[PDB]
Amino acid sequence: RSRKESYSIYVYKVLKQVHPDTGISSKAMGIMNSFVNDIFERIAGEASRLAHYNKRSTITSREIQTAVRLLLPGELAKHAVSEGTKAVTKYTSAK
Amino acid sequence: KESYSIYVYKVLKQVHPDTGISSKAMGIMNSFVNDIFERIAGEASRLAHYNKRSTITSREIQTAVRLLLPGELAKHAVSEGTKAVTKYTSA
Amino acid sequence: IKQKLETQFTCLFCNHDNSVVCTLDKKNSIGLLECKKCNLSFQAPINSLSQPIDIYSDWIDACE
Amino acid sequence: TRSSRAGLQFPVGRVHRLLRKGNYSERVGAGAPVYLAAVLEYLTAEILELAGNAARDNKKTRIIPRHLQLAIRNDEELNKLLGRVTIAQGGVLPNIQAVLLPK
Amino acid sequence: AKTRSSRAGLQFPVGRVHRLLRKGNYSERVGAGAPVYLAAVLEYLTAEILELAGNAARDNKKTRIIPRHLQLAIRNDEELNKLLGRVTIAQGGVLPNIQAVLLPK
Amino acid sequence: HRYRPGTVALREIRRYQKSTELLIRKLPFQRLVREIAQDFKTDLRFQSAAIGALQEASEAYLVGLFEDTNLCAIHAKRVTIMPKDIQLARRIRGERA
Amino acid sequence: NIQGITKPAIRRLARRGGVKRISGLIYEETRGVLKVFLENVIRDAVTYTEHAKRKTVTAMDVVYALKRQGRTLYGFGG
Amino acid sequence: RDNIQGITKPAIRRLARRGGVKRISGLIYEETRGVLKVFLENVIRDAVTYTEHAKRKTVTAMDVVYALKRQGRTLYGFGG
DNA sequence: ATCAGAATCCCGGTGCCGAGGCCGCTCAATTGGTCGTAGACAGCTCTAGCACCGCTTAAACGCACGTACGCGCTGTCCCCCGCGTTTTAACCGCCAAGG
DNA sequence: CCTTGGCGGTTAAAACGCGGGGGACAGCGCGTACGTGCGTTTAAGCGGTGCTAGAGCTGTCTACGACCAATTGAGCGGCCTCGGCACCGGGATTCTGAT
Ligand SMILES: [Zn+2]
Numbered sequence: 001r002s003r004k005e006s007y008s009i010y011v012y013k014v015l016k017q018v019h020p021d022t023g024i025s026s027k028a029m030g031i032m033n034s035f036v037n038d039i040f041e042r043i044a045g046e047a048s049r050l051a052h053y054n055k056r057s058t059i060t061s062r063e064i065q066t067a068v069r070l071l072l073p074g075e076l077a078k079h080a081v082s083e084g085t086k087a088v089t090k091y092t093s094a095k
Numbered sequence: 096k097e098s099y100s101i102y103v104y105k106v107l108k109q110v111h112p113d114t115g116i117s118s119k120a121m122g123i124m125n126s127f128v129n130d131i132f133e134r135i136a137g138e139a140s141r142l143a144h145y146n147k148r149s150t151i152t153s154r155e156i157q158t159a160v161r162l163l164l165p166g167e168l169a170k171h172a173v174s175e176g177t178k179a180v181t182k183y184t185s186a
Numbered sequence: 187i188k189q190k191l192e193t194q195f196t197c198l199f200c201n202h203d204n205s206v207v208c209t210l211d212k213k214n215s216i217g218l219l220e221c222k223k224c225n226l227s228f229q230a231p232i233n234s235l236s237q238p239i240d241i242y243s244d245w246i247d248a249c250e
Numbered sequence: 251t252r253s254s255r256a257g258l259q260f261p262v263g264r265v266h267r268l269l270r271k272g273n274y275s276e277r278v279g280a281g282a283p284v285y286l287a288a289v290l291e292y293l294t295a296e297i298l299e300l301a302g303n304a305a306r307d308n309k310k311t312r313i314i315p316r317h318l319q320l321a322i323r324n325d326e327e328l329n330k331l332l333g334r335v336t337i338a339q340g341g342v343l344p345n346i347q348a349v350l351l352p353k
Numbered sequence: 354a355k356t357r358s359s360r361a362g363l364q365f366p367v368g369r370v371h372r373l374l375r376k377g378n379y380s381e382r383v384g385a386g387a388p389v390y391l392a393a394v395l396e397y398l399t400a401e402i403l404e405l406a407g408n409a410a411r412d413n414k415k416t417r418i419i420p421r422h423l424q425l426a427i428r429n430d431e432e433l434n435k436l437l438g439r440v441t442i443a444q445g446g447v448l449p450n451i452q453a454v455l456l457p458k
Numbered sequence: 459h460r461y462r463p464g465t466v467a468l469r470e471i472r473r474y475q476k477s478t479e480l481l482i483r484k485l486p487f488q489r490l491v492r493e494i495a496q497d498f499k500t501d502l503r504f505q506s507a508a509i510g511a512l513q514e515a516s517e518a519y520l521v522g523l524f525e526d527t528n529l530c531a532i533h534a535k536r537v538t539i540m541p542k543d544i545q546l547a548r549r550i551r552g553e554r555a
Numbered sequence: 556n557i558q559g560i561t562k563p564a565i566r567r568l569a570r571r572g573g574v575k576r577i578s579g580l581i582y583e584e585t586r587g588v589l590k591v592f593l594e595n596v597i598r599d600a601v602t603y604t605e606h607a608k609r610k611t612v613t614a615m616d617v618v619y620a621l622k623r624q625g626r627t628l629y630g631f632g633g
Numbered sequence: 634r635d636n637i638q639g640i641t642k643p644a645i646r647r648l649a650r651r652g653g654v655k656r657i658s659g660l661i662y663e664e665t666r667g668v669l670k671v672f673l674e675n676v677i678r679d680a681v682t683y684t685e686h687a688k689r690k691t692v693t694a695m696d697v698v699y700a701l702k703r704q705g706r707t708l709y710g711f712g713g
Numbered sequence: 714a715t716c717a718g719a720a721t722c723c724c725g726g727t728g729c730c731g732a733g734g735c736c737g738c739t740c741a742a743t744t745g746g747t748c749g750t751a752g753a754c755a756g757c758t759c760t761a762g763c764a765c766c767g768c769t770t771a772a773a774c775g776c777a778c779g780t781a782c783g784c785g786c787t788g789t790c791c792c793c794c795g796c797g798t799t800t801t802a803a804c805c806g807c808c809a810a811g812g
Numbered sequence: 813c814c815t816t817g818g819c820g821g822t823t824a825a826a827a828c829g830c831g832g833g834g835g836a837c838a839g840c841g842c843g844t845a846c847g848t849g850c851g852t853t854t855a856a857g858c859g860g861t862g863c864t865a866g867a868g869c870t871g872t873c874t875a876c877g878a879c880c881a882a883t884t885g886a887g888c889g890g891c892c893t894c895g896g897c898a899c900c901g902g903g904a905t906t907c908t909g910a911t
Contacts, residue, residue: 003740003888010260011294012733017259018295019302023312023732023896027630031315031337032298034629036290038335043286044274046703048378050686053699057276057378058751058877059269061285066686068289070679070703073327076296084288091256091284105364106399111407115417119710123420123442124399126709130440131398132373135391138623140273140379142606145619150382151374153390158606160394162599162623168401168432172394179393180386183361186354187817218501227610229501251742251886261887263742273378277751277877311896312732315630316478338514338630341478342521342571346471347532350575352464420710431555438552443710450653461719462909463794463834467575469720469907474570481567483825485803486559493556494593498601501610508614511631512596515621517568520589524572537835538576538793539569541584548588561826576835577793643773656782659845689867691762 007033043067061088098125135159153180188213193238198249200224208238217241252284260287300325315339357389365392405430420444480513487513523547557586599623640666679703 008029015024046067051057065084069077100121107114138159139151148155157176161169188211195206202223209218210232217232219241230244252262265283269275297318304317319340322332354360357367370388374380405426410418412425424445427433488509495502523544530543548554565585569577596617603616618633627633645662679700684692698713 001889006888007260009887011298014259014291014295015298015302018299021311022302022305025312025314026732027339028313028315028318030632031318031629032294034633035297036294037633038627038629039290039293040268040286043289044269044272048274049699051275051378053683053695054686056752058279059275059277059282060279061282063686064282064285064289066682070682073330076327079296080289080292083292084285087256087258087288088281088285091252092281095255099365102364103399103403106396106403107407110400110403111411113416114407114410117417117419119444120418120420120423122712123423123709126712127402128395128399129713130707130709132370132391132395135394136374136377136379139387141619143380144272145615146606149380150384151380151387152384153386155606156387156390156394158602161602161605165432165435168398168436171401172397175397176390176393179361179363179389183357183389184386186360216500220503225609225611227501227503261742267741273380275378280876319478334625334627336515336518336626336628338511338628339478340514340518341475342525344472344475345573346468347528347573349532350537351468434555439705439707441706441708443708446651452653455655459910460832461795463832464575465908466795467570471570471573471575473721474567475573481571482560482564490557490559491593491597494590495597495601495612498598499605502601502604503611505611505614507631508612508617511614511617511628512593514630515596515626515628516589516593517571519592519626520568520585521572523588524569524574528569528572528574539574539578539581541578541580544581544584544588553588553591563826579793641773657846690865691867 006030007036011036042071046070099128100125134163138162191238193242195238195242197221197223197226198245199226206242208241210236210238210241219245253287256284256288258284258288258291260291262287297321297328300328316341361389361393363393363396365396367392402426402433405433421446480510481517482513484509484513526550557590560586560589595624596620637666637670640669675704676701 006029011032012024012029015022043064047059047063050063050067051059061084065081068080068084071077072080098121103116103121103124107116135156139155142155142159143149143151153176157173160172160176164172188209191208191210192204193206193208194204196203197206200221200223202221205222207220207222209220211217212232212234215231215233217230217236217240219228219230221227228241228245228248230241230248232241253260256262262283265287266278269278269283298313300321301313301317304321305311305313308317310317315337316339319337319342321328322335322337323329323343358365361367367388370392371383374383374388406418406423409422409426409429410416413422420442421444424442425448427437427442428448488504491509491512492504495504526547527539527543530546531537531539534540534543560582562582565582566577568585569575600612600617600620603620604610604612607613607616614631615633618628618631621628622633640662642662645665646657649657676697680692680697683696683700684690687696694711695713698708698711701708702713
């Protein structure tokens with residue numbers, strides 16, 4: 001039996017965080033998995049173009065930041081950059 | 096940082112051998128060639144990752160050229176590619 | 187009316203025996219081989235006289 | 251897990267693996283997947299937060315995809331993002347040109 | 354023939370393309386027939402569009418191809434126009450589109 | 459007795475903006491799609507989920523193109539659609555040359 | 556054939572579009588544009604399955620062909 | 634300042650004529666200016682962001698090329 | 714306006730079914746340890762981006778003025794809405810005679 | 813007596829039909845916004861000229877990353893429950909038009 005992938009449990013937990021009293025359909029969970037897929041793919045493609053228009057092959061978080069604020073529209077993007085940056089601080093401040 | 100200029104000159108002399116060209120015409124042509132190369136190559140990389148094949152042979156390139164260009168161009172291109180495969184494979 | 191027939195032929199790819207199904211559509215002269223195991227499919231033209239051994243023969247020559 | 255060590259919810263190393271097998275670069279840094287995972291996390295938080303409000307509207311408990319399409323089509327920046335996006339069981343805006351309303 | 358270009362009888366450098374594939378982060382490995390195949394496709398595309406370029410430049414008694422010639426030759430094609438639909442050429446312009454409601458009748 | 463026209467149509471617009479269920483039902487759509495693919499290749503057993511995908515994408519596609527065509531006609535100082543309106547909308551999007 | 560598309564189907568398409576009043580030649584024009592749409596879609600879908608070396612077009616290939624025409628659709632594992 | 638009003642009516646005329654437009658209404662020009670402005674807003678935002686990661690205080694032609702390829706309004710001619 | 718009456722909304726009701734809990738696995742994240750060069754950085758050099766101005770001139774601006782498509786209106790004529798009437802796509806239960 | 817064709821029965825969306833009514837289309841007449849010219853004013857363009865951030869380009873050392881054995885428990889495949897919606901009749905209400 002080949003082991004297949006999903007992101008269902010993760011975003012499921014996130015949904016339980018932001019709304020404890022809320023159910024969901026299974027197809028919509030698949031939709032959100034496809035959503036994460038699509039956003040990830042556009043970001044990664046912008047990362048590869050970041051590489052080739054920078055002639056470098058290392059990926060750091062700075063490239064991810066500039067990729068996100070290339071793709072996403074402004075206000076949403078800046079809030080997301082804030083979330084990611086504070087997470088970078090909280091992780092890399094410890095181990 | 097190489098452009099494809101004399102390649103264009105030799106194609107041109109193989110087709111309309113009494114024909115000049117401007118500089119920026121060559122620039123637009125090389126822009127064109129790079130765009131086409133990038134689109135096909137990325138589509139082939141999609142073929143690999145959508146098909147879990149760890150490398151790319153000519154068959155992937157054939158089906159990608161099918162996926163990009165429409166009918167007449169596609170069939171003539173498949174013909175030219177297989178003829179090149181044939182003559183390079185013979186020697 | 188279409189004919190859905192099971193056969194005792196071996197699939198040329200997955201090698202499972204007694205798992206090839208033949209669907210012969212004589213109204214449109216189109217015969218269809220199907221594998222109940224690995225799921226492959228092969229189409230070939232049929233006449234009015236053909237039988238599951240006729241298209242399975244054409245499938246052996248289409249591979250080689 | 252690094253996600254817990256980042257105090258977040260998305261698995262880092264799965265993403266670190268997928269960055270490797272995507273031919274995305276030659277080498278992969280340390281905390282770039284953490285940043286990307288947090289980006290994903292806030293995105294899905296915002297989207298499904300509006301979806302939760304959409305379920306609050308209809309007084310439904312389980313999310314139907316119609317809620318999702320509506321919450322996409324209401325917000326500005328999200329709809330400009332997902333302009334070329336459609337969803338099965340989507341539907342559209344309940345919208346009537348009032349010039350075609352009768353008099 | 355030492356060079357693979359002479360071994361293919363073509364005009365493009367193949368090992369160029371193979372290094373482009375290697376320095377592309379495209380696949381992990383690249384076979385031997387794919388770069389030749391793609392380069393042949395490229396060479397056909399060049400010759401095919403340069404045919405329409407040659408006729409379109411010859412339409413105006415000028416030995417040199419200008420960008421306006423290229424845009425004309427594209428828009429006068431069907432497959433190339435649906436190819437280049439999102440595409441714009443520098444110094445291009447567009448076709449003569451004089452509507453029939455406009456001529457003095 | 460007889461109702462006055464235009465009303466029932468808008469009432470069922472308000473009804474049909476609600477359920478996102480598929481409008482074209484399955485079997486004839488499936489036959490049309492099968493009769494089409496056959497023109498490209500033979501012996502191609504379609505996954506039924508793929509058939510539902512085709513159905514979804516086709517219906518949403520046509521609904522949106524109708525929306526733009528309808529707004530074209532509203533701009534055209536009229537209420538009823540015309541085929542030339544579809545030609546105008548397609549000429550803006552760029553399917554046909 | 557193509558005439559399996561009923562008149563009230565395209566009417567329902569106008570209704571979910573929200574369109575009020577309907578002309579005549581609309582029907583055949585609709586069937587034509589739908590045909591060309593499905594033609595390009597299923598052509599490159601069968602191209603995908605040709606590379607797949609398999610006799611059934613995957614739903615995955617349908618999804619990826621929609622991506623190839625820039626018509627990205629979620630929902631069915633894409 | 635006010636270079637948005639540097640857009641001249643005869644330039645809009647010339648663009649309409651190569652655009653093939655015959656008859657010009659008067660309520661068009663500032664609407665045209667606003668659409669042109671929003672266009673160039675998104676364009677130069679993305680180009681400057683590409684140059685932000687470039688760590689060079691000067692934006693190149695290549696940058697604008699890459700950014701407009703990102704919008705899908707992709708233009709040839711200058712390489713990229 | 715205004716009543717009658719279609720059309721729709723909306724409230725128990727029950728049922729059934731899949732969302733979600735749950736639980737025992739095992740394989741990739743981890744943990745730790747070992748080379749290594751890519752890049753963060755220091756610093757050199759010359760280009761080019763910038764600012765400025767003088768001279769030239771063609772290009773914009775304002776107005777004079779007719780004028781003619783844009784538009785509000787009109788009559789008209791026709792042909793889709795819709796409701797009614799069959800009616801056939803679609804989908805389960807019996808006679809053939811050949812085996 | 814047990815099979816492959818060969819005809820037979822729900823029901824429900826689907827095709828006619830008429831009539832007409834309201835909406836599409838030609839005309840009508842004006843009229844007031846707008847092409848066109850002409851003279852008048854202006855700013856843009858071009859050619860030099862200083863001219864300097866600063867990119868463009870080159871050594872270098874490191875640390876973070878590439879990569880390798882244990883380990884291990886979280887993530888995953890299977891099972892199982894119940895209350896969440898899907899529809900159904902009640903009943904009430906709200907559009908809609910004839911009045
Ligand atoms: Zn098989």
